[PDB]
Amino acid sequence: GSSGSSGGTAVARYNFAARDMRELSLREGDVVRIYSRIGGDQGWWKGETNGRIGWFPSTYVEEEGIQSGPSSG
């Protein structure tokens, strides 16, 4: 597999080391998918990346939106 698409993904703009086995480690430039918006604590989101699943903050990441496609010089 190893396939993915755009739509509900966040990019860790800042390095974040998970303290609890429940949390998810974030690395500068690590994309994360948004599975559930609410479930445990407000703000925190449940995603998955690098074959790891857990709880990661949304404030440390940046929700990727519109993306420029056909852009010439």
Domain of 20 in residue numbering reads as 1-73
* Tokens standing for residue 4: 């993915």
SS3 call for 50: coil
CATH number at residue 21: 2.30.30.40
DSSP 62: E
C-alpha to C-alpha distance for 44 and 34, rounded to whole angstroms: 10
What's the number of domains the chain is made of?
A: 1
Calculate the alpha carbon distances from 59 to 13, 14, 69 in Å: 9, 9, 27
> Experimental technique used?
NMR
